[PDB]
Amino acid sequence: RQEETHDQLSRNLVKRIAATFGELTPAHGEALPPLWHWAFFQDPVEAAGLGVDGHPARGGFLPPADDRNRMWAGGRLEFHQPLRVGGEASRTSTILRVEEKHGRSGALLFVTLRHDYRQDGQLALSEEHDIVYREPTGTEALPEGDWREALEPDPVLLFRYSAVTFNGHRIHYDWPYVTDAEGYPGLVVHGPLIATLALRAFCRANPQARLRRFAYRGLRPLICPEPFEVGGRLLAAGKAEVWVGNGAGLAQRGDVEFD
Amino acid sequence: APWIGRQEETHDQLSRNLVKRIAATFGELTPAHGEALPPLWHWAFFQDPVEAAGLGVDGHPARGGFDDRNRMWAGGRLEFHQPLRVGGEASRTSTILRVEEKHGRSGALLFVTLRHDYRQDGQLALSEEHDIVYREPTEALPEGDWREALEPDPVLLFRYSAVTFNGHRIHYDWPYVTDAEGYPGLVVHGPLIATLALRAFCRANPQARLRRFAYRGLRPLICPEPFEVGGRLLAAGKAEVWVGNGAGLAQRGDVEFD
């Protein structure tokens, strides 16, 4: 069940994430910005090990030759101390739960991974990640908030985010595939990309906040290159909500707790 | 004022986490800490990407010496002094060696040659020239001593762009590469097929100690067309390598070794 892997949070890759987001590259020993840890702990497989969608070949939990579309659906993180640039870190991972649910387009499989990240023998971060497999497929409207950021995705941004995460999933860069093969209108803006943007905006609007908890859940896919915004609002001291959306409604919602 | 001769230095760590991603892209073994970085994998490193706001429309950094022309990796030459070590620090000293613009009947052609010298632990490890061409949008496969058959796909191309953190849209943005730059499909990277061509030479001659490699693109290789790499020995310590398919050669190169 449990698997422990290791990585260096090396500055060369941190530079590439920072450039992707248009942000500064922290120096050795400084805090890895929130959710940039997704660029690390990658153990990619050779092509023979890959599935048609570019991800690692679908394993035992799925039926043979599963045609369903895989999606990064949401997750939850608990923040204890920042991981630090230039240091090593271990990730202890486990499949927490697998579950069949009944979706709008048919039955969808829900996989929840749990990861614990340690540095210098201390737990820095705990995460749950929800992965969904669903069949080829009226959200809440964009509410008013205390901050907002307008964004305009393009394929270079999406390609770069896939690059720093070394995610082979073809829905983020292979336009003929994402349309003809899995039936989307165009490229999908990564769930974790917009989560990072929404959390980043909260932090900008709240620079003294010290993150304790972040939850995010996708509602509908965002398609490149349609403009969108990230927003949020304080609900109470140390409590905020965030969202990602546009004129067609919200694509992602999330919850922040902080000190 | 003179564009050539301005030296710039950059530093990196040849960290194994990115070596694993290169190894996976190529389906090769992942060298252990402290072993040799395989030939031409140095291209995954020394990346100083620019922020999204300083990117040109083709996904490369914006042109400072301006504009609408296609940029292409034309060729290069390398001299191998000693292998770079996985896990070590390394430095690259770079300069513009030569610049030429010709205003001919097919538009203006801008040719640029960069020089890179790579040092590790106070020793020169590798020297490189890289030829870049800017140009307005647009032989048979010989018999040899060795050959390898290859089928490109967009994941491969995406992965090679990822490890080189190369934003150029011709390697992954199918609507751009066709409509905007006039190719028939995704372009298989020159450096990628150069790595494949040299790697197949090293496979067929595992005792060969590389001294020099030269490569030149001849025509774009388009994904997903099957292609093959090969080459043959010309003389003691001399080989030629090539990349091509039924449609003709896409790249040639020369290997000197001992």
Short mmCIF file of C-alpha atoms in Angstrom, two decimals:
data_model
loop_
_atom_site.label_atom_id
_atom_site.label_comp_id
_atom_site.label_asym_id
_atom_site.label_seq_id
_atom_site.Cartn_x
_atom_site.Cartn_y
_atom_site.Cartn_z
CA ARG A 1 0.00 0.00 0.00
CA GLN A 2 2.25 2.83 1.27
CA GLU A 3 5.00 4.24 -0.97
CA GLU A 4 7.79 6.66 -0.01
CA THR A 5 9.57 8.70 -2.67
CA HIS A 6 12.20 11.46 -2.52
CA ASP A 7 13.13 14.57 -4.51
CA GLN A 8 15.27 17.67 -4.39
CA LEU A 9 13.25 20.88 -4.65
CA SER A 10 15.93 22.11 -6.98
CA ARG A 11 16.06 25.70 -8.05
CA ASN A 12 16.42 24.87 -11.75
CA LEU A 13 12.87 23.50 -11.82
CA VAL A 14 11.60 26.20 -9.45
CA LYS A 15 12.77 28.75 -12.01
CA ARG A 16 10.57 27.10 -14.66
CA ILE A 17 7.48 27.14 -12.43
CA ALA A 18 8.11 30.75 -11.52
CA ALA A 19 8.42 31.75 -15.18
CA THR A 20 5.20 29.83 -15.97
CA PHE A 21 3.33 31.90 -13.37
CA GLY A 22 5.18 35.17 -13.94
CA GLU A 23 6.53 35.14 -10.38
CA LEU A 24 9.86 35.54 -8.61
CA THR A 25 12.10 32.52 -8.04
CA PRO A 26 12.73 32.19 -4.30
CA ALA A 27 16.30 31.76 -3.17
CA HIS A 28 17.87 28.72 -1.55
CA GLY A 29 16.25 27.98 1.78
CA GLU A 30 13.21 30.15 1.11
CA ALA A 31 9.62 28.87 0.99
CA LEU A 32 8.46 27.00 -2.07
CA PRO A 33 5.27 28.91 -2.93
CA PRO A 34 1.99 27.12 -2.23
CA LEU A 35 1.06 24.28 -4.61
CA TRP A 36 4.38 24.56 -6.50
CA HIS A 37 5.17 21.23 -4.85
CA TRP A 38 3.12 19.65 -7.67
CA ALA A 39 6.13 20.20 -9.90
CA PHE A 40 8.11 17.71 -7.85
CA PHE A 41 8.05 14.02 -6.90
CA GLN A 42 7.68 12.93 -10.54
CA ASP A 43 8.54 9.30 -11.39
CA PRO A 44 7.53 9.17 -15.06
CA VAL A 45 7.33 5.97 -17.07
CA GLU A 46 8.62 5.17 -20.54
CA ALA A 47 6.18 5.29 -23.47
CA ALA A 48 5.41 1.56 -23.35
CA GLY A 49 4.05 2.26 -19.85
CA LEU A 50 1.80 5.07 -21.01
CA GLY A 51 -1.84 4.95 -21.87
CA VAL A 52 -3.43 6.44 -24.93
CA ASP A 53 -4.28 9.59 -22.98
CA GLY A 54 -0.60 10.24 -22.14
CA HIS A 55 -0.96 9.32 -18.47
CA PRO A 56 0.59 6.11 -17.09
CA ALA A 57 -1.36 3.11 -18.37
CA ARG A 58 -4.63 2.57 -16.53
CA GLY A 59 -4.18 0.06 -13.72
CA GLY A 60 -6.15 -2.66 -12.01
CA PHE A 61 -8.96 -0.50 -10.65
CA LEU A 62 -10.20 0.24 -14.15
CA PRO A 63 -11.80 -2.19 -16.63
CA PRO A 64 -9.62 -3.33 -19.54
CA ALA A 65 -9.19 -0.69 -22.23
CA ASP A 66 -11.09 1.91 -20.25
CA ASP A 67 -12.41 4.60 -22.62
CA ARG A 68 -13.42 7.08 -19.91
CA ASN A 69 -11.79 10.48 -19.58
CA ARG A 70 -9.51 11.03 -16.60
CA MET A 71 -9.71 14.32 -14.73
CA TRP A 72 -8.03 16.07 -11.80
CA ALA A 73 -11.22 16.72 -9.88
CA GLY A 74 -10.24 18.40 -6.61
CA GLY A 75 -8.33 17.95 -3.42
CA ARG A 76 -7.54 19.10 0.08
CA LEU A 77 -4.29 20.26 1.64
CA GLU A 78 -3.12 20.82 5.19
CA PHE A 79 -0.22 23.25 5.56
CA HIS A 80 2.14 22.92 8.53
CA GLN A 81 5.36 24.56 7.37
CA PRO A 82 6.48 25.55 3.88
CA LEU A 83 8.66 23.21 1.95
CA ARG A 84 11.95 25.00 1.25
CA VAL A 85 13.75 25.64 -2.03
CA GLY A 86 16.97 23.73 -2.53
CA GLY A 87 16.28 21.11 0.13
CA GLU A 88 15.32 17.49 -0.19
CA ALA A 89 11.91 16.22 0.70
CA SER A 90 10.15 12.88 1.03
CA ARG A 91 6.61 12.06 -0.07
CA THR A 92 4.72 9.20 1.60
CA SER A 93 1.75 8.22 -0.54
CA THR A 94 -1.25 5.92 -0.29
CA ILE A 95 -4.44 5.23 -2.18
CA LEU A 96 -6.97 6.35 0.43
CA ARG A 97 -10.18 5.32 -1.28
CA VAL A 98 -11.68 4.19 -4.57
CA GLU A 99 -15.41 4.60 -5.14
CA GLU A 100 -18.02 4.24 -7.87
CA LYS A 101 -20.56 7.09 -7.98
CA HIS A 102 -23.33 7.97 -10.46
CA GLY A 103 -22.48 11.01 -12.55
CA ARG A 104 -24.49 13.20 -14.87
CA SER A 105 -23.16 11.45 -18.01
CA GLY A 106 -22.97 7.96 -16.45
CA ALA A 107 -21.01 6.19 -13.74
CA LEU A 108 -17.79 7.87 -12.60
CA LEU A 109 -14.93 6.37 -10.60
CA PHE A 110 -13.45 8.44 -7.79
CA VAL A 111 -9.90 7.83 -6.64
CA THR A 112 -8.48 9.64 -3.64
CA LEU A 113 -4.74 9.73 -3.09
CA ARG A 114 -3.16 10.84 0.16
CA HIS A 115 0.34 12.35 0.31
CA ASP A 116 2.43 13.37 3.32
CA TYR A 117 5.45 15.57 2.61
CA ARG A 118 8.38 15.75 5.03
CA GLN A 119 11.60 17.78 5.13
CA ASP A 120 14.30 17.50 7.81
CA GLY A 121 12.16 14.89 9.59
CA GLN A 122 9.19 17.26 10.02
CA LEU A 123 5.80 17.00 8.33
CA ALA A 124 5.46 20.05 6.13
CA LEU A 125 2.30 19.28 4.17
CA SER A 126 -0.48 16.75 3.88
CA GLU A 127 -2.64 16.40 0.81
CA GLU A 128 -5.60 14.51 -0.59
CA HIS A 129 -6.01 14.40 -4.36
CA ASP A 130 -9.27 13.32 -6.04
CA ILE A 131 -8.98 11.79 -9.50
CA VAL A 132 -12.12 11.00 -11.53
CA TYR A 133 -12.82 8.79 -14.54
CA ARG A 134 -16.06 9.73 -16.29
CA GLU A 135 -17.81 9.26 -19.67
CA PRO A 136 -17.53 11.89 -22.46
CA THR A 137 -19.67 14.88 -21.44
CA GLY A 138 -25.58 25.61 -15.52
CA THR A 139 -23.01 26.36 -12.84
CA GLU A 140 -23.32 29.00 -10.13
CA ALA A 141 -22.78 32.49 -11.48
CA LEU A 142 -19.60 34.43 -10.75
CA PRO A 143 -20.22 36.12 -7.38
CA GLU A 144 -18.92 39.49 -6.24
CA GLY A 145 -15.86 39.42 -4.01
CA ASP A 146 -13.15 41.43 -2.30
CA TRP A 147 -10.46 40.59 -4.87
CA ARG A 148 -10.35 39.39 -8.47
CA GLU A 149 -7.73 38.80 -11.19
CA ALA A 150 -8.47 38.63 -14.90
CA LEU A 151 -6.62 35.90 -16.75
CA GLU A 152 -6.25 34.88 -20.39
CA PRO A 153 -4.99 31.33 -20.92
CA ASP A 154 -3.03 30.30 -24.00
CA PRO A 155 -1.40 27.07 -25.14
CA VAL A 156 2.10 28.16 -24.04
CA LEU A 157 0.92 28.63 -20.46
CA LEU A 158 -0.80 25.26 -20.49
CA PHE A 159 2.14 23.56 -22.13
CA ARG A 160 4.49 25.06 -19.52
CA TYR A 161 2.38 23.95 -16.57
CA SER A 162 2.24 20.45 -18.04
CA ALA A 163 6.00 20.70 -18.54
CA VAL A 164 6.90 21.61 -14.97
CA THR A 165 4.61 18.84 -13.64
CA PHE A 166 5.87 16.56 -16.46
CA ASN A 167 2.24 15.49 -16.94
CA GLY A 168 1.79 13.66 -20.24
CA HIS A 169 -2.01 14.04 -20.20
CA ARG A 170 -2.91 15.00 -23.76
CA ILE A 171 -5.95 17.11 -22.91
CA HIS A 172 -3.67 20.00 -21.95
CA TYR A 173 -1.62 20.29 -25.18
CA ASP A 174 -2.85 17.88 -27.96
CA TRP A 175 -5.67 19.82 -29.58
CA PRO A 176 -6.68 17.13 -32.13
CA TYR A 177 -6.80 14.60 -29.30
CA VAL A 178 -8.70 16.62 -26.73
CA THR A 179 -11.42 17.38 -29.29
CA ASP A 180 -11.74 14.27 -31.47
CA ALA A 181 -10.72 11.68 -28.90
CA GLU A 182 -12.27 12.85 -25.62
CA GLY A 183 -14.79 15.35 -26.96
CA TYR A 184 -13.92 18.65 -25.38
CA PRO A 185 -14.24 21.97 -27.26
CA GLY A 186 -10.50 22.53 -26.97
CA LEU A 187 -7.58 22.36 -24.57
CA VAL A 188 -8.39 21.97 -20.88
CA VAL A 189 -6.91 24.45 -18.40
CA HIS A 190 -5.56 22.22 -15.65
CA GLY A 191 -7.53 21.97 -12.44
CA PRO A 192 -4.43 22.36 -10.28
CA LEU A 193 -3.29 25.32 -12.42
CA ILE A 194 -6.41 27.32 -11.67
CA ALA A 195 -6.38 26.15 -8.06
CA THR A 196 -2.87 27.59 -7.78
CA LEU A 197 -4.03 30.81 -9.41
CA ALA A 198 -7.06 31.12 -7.09
CA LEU A 199 -4.99 30.47 -3.98
CA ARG A 200 -2.29 32.84 -5.20
CA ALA A 201 -4.85 35.61 -5.57
CA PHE A 202 -6.12 35.05 -2.05
CA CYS A 203 -2.55 35.34 -0.73
CA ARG A 204 -1.89 38.53 -2.72
CA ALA A 205 -5.08 40.07 -1.38
CA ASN A 206 -4.06 38.87 2.15
CA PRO A 207 -0.27 39.07 2.40
CA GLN A 208 -0.07 38.47 6.15
CA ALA A 209 -2.22 35.32 6.00
CA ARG A 210 -0.47 32.13 7.04
CA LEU A 211 -2.12 29.23 5.23
CA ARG A 212 -3.53 26.40 7.29
CA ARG A 213 -5.97 24.63 4.97
CA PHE A 214 -7.04 24.73 1.34
CA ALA A 215 -9.74 22.73 -0.39
CA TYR A 216 -10.61 22.97 -4.10
CA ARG A 217 -13.20 21.26 -6.26
CA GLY A 218 -13.78 21.45 -10.00
CA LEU A 219 -17.29 22.13 -11.35
CA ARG A 220 -16.81 22.31 -15.15
CA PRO A 221 -13.74 22.28 -17.41
CA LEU A 222 -12.22 25.59 -18.49
CA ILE A 223 -11.25 25.58 -22.16
CA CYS A 224 -8.31 27.37 -23.70
CA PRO A 225 -8.22 30.18 -24.67
CA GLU A 226 -11.41 31.57 -23.09
CA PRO A 227 -10.75 34.40 -20.60
CA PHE A 228 -11.68 33.81 -16.97
CA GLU A 229 -11.06 35.34 -13.57
CA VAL A 230 -10.10 34.09 -10.13
CA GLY A 231 -11.80 35.65 -7.13
CA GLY A 232 -12.70 35.22 -3.52
CA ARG A 233 -13.86 36.88 -0.34
CA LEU A 234 -13.35 36.73 3.39
CA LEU A 235 -16.12 34.90 5.23
CA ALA A 236 -14.66 35.46 8.74
CA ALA A 237 -11.27 36.05 10.32
CA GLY A 238 -8.99 33.30 9.07
CA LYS A 239 -11.64 31.96 6.65
CA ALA A 240 -12.09 32.66 2.93
CA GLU A 241 -13.64 31.21 -0.17
CA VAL A 242 -12.23 31.39 -3.68
CA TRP A 243 -13.53 30.72 -7.15
CA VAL A 244 -12.52 30.51 -10.81
CA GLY A 245 -15.06 31.38 -13.46
CA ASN A 246 -16.33 33.45 -16.34
CA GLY A 247 -19.59 34.49 -18.02
CA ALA A 248 -20.67 30.87 -18.39
CA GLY A 249 -20.38 30.46 -14.60
CA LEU A 250 -17.95 29.04 -12.11
CA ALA A 251 -15.46 26.35 -13.06
CA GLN A 252 -13.85 25.81 -9.67
CA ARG A 253 -14.58 26.65 -6.05
CA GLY A 254 -12.34 26.44 -3.03
CA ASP A 255 -12.03 27.11 0.67
CA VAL A 256 -9.13 28.65 2.60
CA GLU A 257 -8.41 28.57 6.31
CA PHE A 258 -5.52 30.60 7.69
CA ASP A 259 -3.96 32.42 10.66
CA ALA B 1 27.28 47.81 -29.80
CA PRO B 2 28.83 44.79 -31.58
CA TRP B 3 26.28 41.99 -31.11
CA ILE B 4 28.85 39.19 -31.23
CA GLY B 5 31.34 38.65 -28.40
CA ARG B 6 29.13 39.58 -25.44
CA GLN B 7 29.81 36.75 -22.96
CA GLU B 8 27.07 35.59 -20.57
CA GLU B 9 27.38 32.91 -17.90
CA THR B 10 24.75 30.69 -16.35
CA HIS B 11 24.94 28.05 -13.65
CA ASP B 12 22.99 24.87 -13.05
CA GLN B 13 22.78 21.64 -11.07
CA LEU B 14 22.55 18.52 -13.26
CA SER B 15 19.96 17.19 -10.88
CA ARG B 16 18.75 13.62 -11.21
CA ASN B 17 15.07 14.56 -10.92
CA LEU B 18 15.19 16.11 -14.38
CA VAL B 19 17.46 13.31 -15.65
CA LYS B 20 14.69 10.82 -14.85
CA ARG B 21 12.31 12.79 -17.07
CA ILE B 22 14.75 12.79 -19.96
CA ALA B 23 15.38 9.07 -19.54
CA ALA B 24 11.63 8.45 -19.63
CA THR B 25 11.18 10.57 -22.76
CA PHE B 26 13.78 8.48 -24.57
CA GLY B 27 12.94 5.15 -22.92
CA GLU B 28 16.50 4.87 -21.68
CA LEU B 29 17.98 3.85 -18.35
CA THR B 30 18.24 6.64 -15.78
CA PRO B 31 21.92 7.15 -14.89
CA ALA B 32 22.72 7.01 -11.18
CA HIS B 33 24.02 9.94 -9.14
CA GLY B 34 27.59 10.56 -10.21
CA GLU B 35 27.47 8.79 -13.55
CA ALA B 36 27.87 10.40 -16.96
CA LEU B 37 25.04 12.50 -18.35
CA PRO B 38 24.28 10.84 -21.71
CA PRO B 39 25.34 12.69 -24.86
CA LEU B 40 23.23 15.78 -25.71
CA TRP B 41 21.06 15.47 -22.58
CA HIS B 42 22.86 18.67 -21.45
CA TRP B 43 20.14 20.42 -23.50
CA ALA B 44 17.66 19.73 -20.70
CA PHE B 45 19.74 22.01 -18.46
CA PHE B 46 20.93 25.60 -18.26
CA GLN B 47 17.44 26.89 -18.87
CA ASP B 48 16.77 30.54 -17.99
CA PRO B 49 13.14 30.75 -19.11
CA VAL B 50 11.46 34.12 -19.31
CA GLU B 51 8.15 35.10 -17.82
CA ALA B 52 5.03 34.65 -19.93
CA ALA B 53 4.97 38.41 -20.49
CA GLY B 54 8.34 38.36 -22.30
CA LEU B 55 7.37 35.55 -24.67
CA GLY B 56 6.87 36.04 -28.38
CA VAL B 57 3.85 34.63 -30.18
CA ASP B 58 5.76 31.56 -31.31
CA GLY B 59 6.36 30.55 -27.65
CA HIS B 60 10.03 31.47 -27.73
CA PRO B 61 11.36 34.50 -25.85
CA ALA B 62 10.39 37.70 -27.60
CA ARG B 63 12.68 38.98 -30.34
CA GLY B 64 14.75 41.97 -29.22
CA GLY B 65 16.61 42.29 -32.48
CA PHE B 66 13.43 42.56 -34.56
CA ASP B 67 9.67 39.52 -36.61
CA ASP B 68 7.08 37.42 -38.51
CA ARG B 69 9.63 34.82 -39.64
CA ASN B 70 9.76 31.17 -38.58
CA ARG B 71 12.62 30.39 -36.20
CA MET B 72 14.32 27.04 -36.66
CA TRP B 73 17.05 24.96 -34.98
CA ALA B 74 19.22 24.53 -38.02
CA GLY B 75 22.20 22.50 -36.84
CA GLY B 76 25.17 22.47 -34.57
CA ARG B 77 28.64 21.19 -33.77
CA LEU B 78 29.93 19.80 -30.49
CA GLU B 79 33.34 18.83 -29.09
CA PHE B 80 33.29 16.36 -26.20
CA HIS B 81 36.13 16.77 -23.74
CA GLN B 82 34.77 14.85 -20.77
CA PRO B 83 31.27 13.83 -19.68
CA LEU B 84 29.18 16.01 -17.40
CA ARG B 85 28.40 14.30 -14.05
CA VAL B 86 24.82 13.72 -12.88
CA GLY B 87 24.29 15.51 -9.60
CA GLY B 88 27.14 17.98 -10.09
CA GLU B 89 27.07 21.73 -10.52
CA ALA B 90 28.06 23.08 -13.93
CA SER B 91 28.43 26.36 -15.75
CA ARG B 92 27.76 27.45 -19.31
CA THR B 93 29.58 30.40 -20.84
CA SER B 94 27.75 31.60 -23.95
CA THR B 95 28.32 34.12 -26.71
CA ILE B 96 26.98 35.05 -30.12
CA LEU B 97 29.66 33.92 -32.55
CA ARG B 98 28.29 35.07 -35.90
CA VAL B 99 25.28 36.82 -37.37
CA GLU B 100 24.32 37.10 -41.04
CA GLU B 101 21.29 38.51 -42.81
CA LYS B 102 20.88 38.00 -46.56
CA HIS B 103 18.10 39.84 -48.40
CA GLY B 104 17.47 37.39 -51.24
CA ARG B 105 14.60 36.62 -53.58
CA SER B 106 12.82 34.42 -50.99
CA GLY B 107 12.76 37.15 -48.34
CA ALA B 108 15.34 37.99 -45.72
CA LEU B 109 17.22 35.04 -44.15
CA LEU B 110 18.82 35.62 -40.74
CA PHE B 111 21.46 33.10 -39.66
CA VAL B 112 22.77 33.07 -36.09
CA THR B 113 25.47 30.93 -34.49
CA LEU B 114 25.80 30.73 -30.71
CA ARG B 115 28.83 29.34 -28.93
CA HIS B 116 28.47 27.57 -25.57
CA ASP B 117 31.25 26.27 -23.34
CA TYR B 118 30.32 24.00 -20.44
CA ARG B 119 32.59 23.70 -17.39
CA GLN B 120 32.35 21.45 -14.34
CA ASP B 121 34.80 21.35 -11.44
CA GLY B 122 37.13 23.82 -13.16
CA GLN B 123 37.48 21.72 -16.33
CA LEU B 124 36.07 22.32 -19.79
CA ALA B 125 33.65 19.45 -20.33
CA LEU B 126 31.90 20.30 -23.59
CA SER B 127 32.04 22.93 -26.31
CA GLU B 128 29.13 23.66 -28.63
CA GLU B 129 28.07 25.75 -31.56
CA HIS B 130 24.34 26.05 -32.36
CA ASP B 131 22.96 27.40 -35.65
CA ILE B 132 19.59 29.16 -35.57
CA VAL B 133 17.80 30.34 -38.75
CA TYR B 134 14.92 32.76 -39.22
CA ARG B 135 13.11 32.38 -42.53
CA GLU B 136 9.71 33.06 -44.04
CA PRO B 137 7.25 30.15 -43.95
CA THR B 138 7.79 27.59 -46.70
CA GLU B 139 18.32 12.40 -50.67
CA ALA B 140 16.95 8.85 -50.29
CA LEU B 141 17.52 6.86 -47.11
CA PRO B 142 21.00 5.31 -47.53
CA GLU B 143 21.97 1.79 -46.52
CA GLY B 144 24.15 1.58 -43.45
CA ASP B 145 25.71 -0.53 -40.73
CA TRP B 146 22.94 0.09 -38.15
CA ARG B 147 19.38 1.38 -38.02
CA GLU B 148 16.58 2.01 -35.55
CA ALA B 149 12.91 2.46 -36.37
CA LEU B 150 10.94 5.15 -34.60
CA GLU B 151 7.32 6.25 -34.42
CA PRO B 152 6.89 9.81 -33.09
CA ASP B 153 3.74 10.88 -31.28
CA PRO B 154 2.65 14.08 -29.58
CA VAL B 155 3.47 12.80 -26.07
CA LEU B 156 7.09 12.25 -27.11
CA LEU B 157 7.29 15.70 -28.66
CA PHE B 158 5.59 17.29 -25.67
CA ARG B 159 7.98 15.52 -23.29
CA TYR B 160 11.09 16.61 -25.20
CA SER B 161 9.86 20.21 -25.14
CA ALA B 162 9.13 19.83 -21.41
CA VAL B 163 12.56 18.59 -20.43
CA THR B 164 14.16 21.41 -22.49
CA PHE B 165 11.45 23.78 -21.21
CA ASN B 166 11.19 24.98 -24.82
CA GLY B 167 7.98 26.93 -25.33
CA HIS B 168 8.17 26.92 -29.17
CA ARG B 169 4.63 26.11 -30.32
CA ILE B 170 5.64 24.13 -33.41
CA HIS B 171 6.31 21.08 -31.22
CA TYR B 172 2.89 20.82 -29.54
CA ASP B 173 0.36 23.42 -30.81
CA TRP B 174 -1.16 21.77 -33.86
CA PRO B 175 -3.40 24.67 -34.92
CA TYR B 176 -0.45 27.04 -34.62
CA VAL B 177 2.13 24.92 -36.37
CA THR B 178 -0.17 24.45 -39.39
CA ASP B 179 -2.12 27.70 -39.71
CA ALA B 180 0.48 30.11 -38.37
CA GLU B 181 3.82 28.70 -39.57
CA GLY B 182 2.69 26.57 -42.49
CA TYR B 183 4.02 23.17 -41.61
CA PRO B 184 1.84 20.13 -42.32
CA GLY B 185 1.82 19.03 -38.63
CA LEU B 186 3.82 19.05 -35.41
CA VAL B 187 7.58 19.33 -35.99
CA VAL B 188 9.90 16.71 -34.53
CA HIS B 189 12.66 18.64 -32.84
CA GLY B 190 16.04 18.84 -34.52
CA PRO B 191 17.87 18.29 -31.22
CA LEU B 192 15.61 15.30 -30.41
CA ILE B 193 16.43 13.46 -33.63
CA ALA B 194 20.07 14.48 -33.27
CA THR B 195 20.06 12.80 -29.84
CA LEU B 196 18.40 9.72 -31.38
CA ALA B 197 20.91 9.63 -34.25
CA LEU B 198 23.93 9.96 -31.97
CA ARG B 199 22.47 7.50 -29.47
CA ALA B 200 21.99 4.87 -32.16
CA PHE B 201 25.60 5.38 -33.18
CA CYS B 202 26.70 4.88 -29.56
CA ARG B 203 24.58 1.73 -29.32
CA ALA B 204 26.15 0.28 -32.46
CA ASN B 205 29.65 1.29 -31.25
CA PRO B 206 29.59 1.03 -27.43
CA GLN B 207 33.39 1.19 -27.14
CA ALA B 208 33.51 4.45 -29.12
CA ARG B 209 34.62 7.45 -27.06
CA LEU B 210 32.91 10.46 -28.60
CA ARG B 211 35.14 13.34 -29.62
CA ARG B 212 33.01 15.42 -32.02
CA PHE B 213 29.52 15.50 -33.48
CA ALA B 214 28.10 17.70 -36.19
CA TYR B 215 24.46 17.75 -37.32
CA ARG B 216 22.41 19.70 -39.84
CA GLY B 217 18.70 19.69 -40.55
CA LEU B 218 17.71 19.03 -44.17
CA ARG B 219 13.89 19.12 -44.06
CA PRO B 220 11.26 19.20 -41.30
CA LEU B 221 10.24 15.88 -39.85
CA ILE B 222 6.50 15.87 -39.20
CA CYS B 223 4.68 13.95 -36.47
CA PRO B 224 3.42 11.22 -36.54
CA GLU B 225 5.28 9.96 -39.60
CA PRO B 226 7.42 6.90 -38.85
CA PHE B 227 11.11 7.50 -39.50
CA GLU B 228 14.40 5.83 -38.76
CA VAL B 229 17.90 6.77 -37.67
CA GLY B 230 21.05 5.15 -38.91
CA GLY B 231 24.61 5.58 -40.00
CA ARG B 232 27.79 3.83 -41.01
CA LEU B 233 31.51 3.93 -40.33
CA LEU B 234 33.49 5.86 -42.94
CA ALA B 235 37.03 5.26 -41.61
CA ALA B 236 38.75 4.64 -38.28
CA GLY B 237 37.11 6.95 -35.76
CA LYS B 238 34.82 8.49 -38.41
CA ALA B 239 31.09 7.86 -38.94
CA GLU B 240 28.09 9.44 -40.59
CA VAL B 241 24.57 9.32 -39.18
CA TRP B 242 21.24 10.28 -40.72
CA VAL B 243 17.51 10.48 -39.95
CA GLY B 244 14.86 9.90 -42.60
CA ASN B 245 11.98 7.97 -44.08
CA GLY B 246 10.52 7.10 -47.47
CA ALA B 247 10.19 10.83 -48.09
CA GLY B 248 13.95 11.44 -47.82
CA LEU B 249 16.53 12.50 -45.28
CA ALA B 250 15.52 14.92 -42.54
CA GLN B 251 18.91 15.31 -40.86
CA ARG B 252 22.48 14.23 -41.35
CA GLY B 253 25.47 14.39 -39.06
CA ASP B 254 29.07 13.40 -38.56
CA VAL B 255 30.72 11.58 -35.68
CA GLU B 256 34.42 11.59 -34.79
CA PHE B 257 35.57 9.23 -32.05
CA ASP B 258 38.41 7.03 -30.81
#
